[PDB]
Design a protein around this ligand. Structure first.
Ligand SMILES: CC(=O)SCCNC(=O)CCNC(=O)[C@H](O)C(C)(C)COP(=O)(O)OP(=O)(O)OC[C@H]1O[C@@H](n2cnc3c(N)ncnc32)[C@H](O)[C@@H]1OP(=O)(O)O
Ligand SMILES: CC(=O)SCCNC(=O)CCNC(=O)[C@H](O)C(C)(C)COP(=O)(O)OP(=O)(O)OC[C@H]1O[C@@H](n2cnc3c(N)ncnc32)[C@H](O)[C@@H]1OP(=O)(O)O
Lengths: 174, 173
């Protein structure tokens, strides 16, 4: 059993620990410096009313995070969100990522977003397969765009499209 | 015509050119006019590590091509973004491609790995110019922007260089 719920400030140290592990050990993101919980909490409090920030809690512990934010700082992009998801290494492939994203995506759809973009450093078969299983389509890839872990890595963009009319209404808060 | 390094004195004229396209076109997805200070700030911050070039015709700024960081992670340090705008008075007289030729020669010699151009679509003139200079289409987000009454796709084009593994730091201009 798992509670997918809105993330709180108290969850952020655990989230920071999870994501830092992947920063250190994975090329799925191209960060090469760990983050501090303060940055996570600052971002949460700044964005959580506009974008869904969700955690999966299992047996009282934070086991995963999924969150959205703006894609690019232009008004024209207001209906385009970025999504991110990390599940604790002890909790992989138990459906948490899917559940987190289903809740995330349903929120963004109801809020009136046009689409959601996922940036995936490659190769990362689990993330690619999970994103495609949830309806994201591969939209292209920049070759050898990042140097991390001693090699050049491609970065791919996946996108899940919603239907909106012309013109779109301003998006709703969470 | 002159192809030379961009200076702070050029920035109001550049800002005026790009603001015209912001106002009248969807070739970029900004909706609000920019102030020249935004241009000056980026020029001052970037001009030592990235080429910023202006075309000058009959003594007036006629276009700009400039590069900057693709993304603010150190892993992207060898990946540049390129951008080019020519005044509507000076379109299709070789300035854009000449500017880019110089820009690209610099980025290659400085030791970048690749250059990425972001093209709000449709923009046949820009796609044609980029592909003629060796950029390859690398993908496209659908309906990523809403501007001037319609959804617009945005495409990414990339020109690849080659570097050893590991790369050395990029050289300054
Ligand atoms: C956020 C971005 O845009 S990129 C960063 C993605 N995050 C990471 O790479 C961190 C490390 N990995 C993870 O956190 C997780 O593996 C995630 C988030 C990629 C996937 O979440 P999980 O909870 O493990 O996946 P979940 O159990 O919901 O599986 C959903 C579907 O995704 C696919 N899938 C998931 N994991 C794998 C895997 N190792 N190999 C192949 N397919 C997989 C499968 O289709 C799976 O369905 P199935 O189990 O019925 O066969
Ligand atoms: C910056 C980015 O990554 S996207 C934003 C690009 N900037 C803009 O769209 C602003 C408005 N347009 C412009 O400033 C210019 O038209 C640019 C920058 C796209 C091209 O610069 P120009 O100086 O006009 O191009 P230039 O004269 O060097 O022509 C080079 C090639 O580009 C193509 N091209 C340029 N203009 C056109 C046009 N109207 N129609 C079709 N093809 C064109 C052609 O292949 C041309 O080669 P050719 O003349 O031998 O047939």
């Amino acid at each position: 059993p798992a509670d997918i719920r809105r993330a709180t400030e108290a969850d952020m140290p655990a989230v920071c620990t999870i994501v830092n592990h992947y920063i250190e050990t994975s090329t799925v993101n191209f960060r090469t410096e760990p983050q501090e919980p303060q940055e996570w909490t600052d971002d949460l409090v700044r964005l959580r009313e506009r974008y869904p920030w969700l955690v999966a809690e299992v047996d009282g512990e934070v086991a995963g995070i999924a969150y959205a934010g703006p894609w690019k700082a232009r008004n024209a992009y207001d209906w385009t969100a970025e999504s991110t998801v990390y599940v604790s290494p002890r909790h992989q492939r138990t459906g948490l990522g899917s559940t987190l994203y289903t809740h995330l995506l349903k929120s963004l759809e109801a809020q009136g977003f046009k689409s959601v973009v996922a940036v995936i450093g490659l190769p990362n078969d689990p993330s690619v397969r999970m994103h495609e299983a949830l309806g994201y389509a591969p939209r292209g890839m920049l070759r050898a765009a990042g140097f991390k872990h001693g090699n050049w890595h491609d970065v791919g963009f996946w996108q899940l499209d919603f239907s909106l009319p012309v013109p779109p209404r301003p998006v709703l808060p969470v």
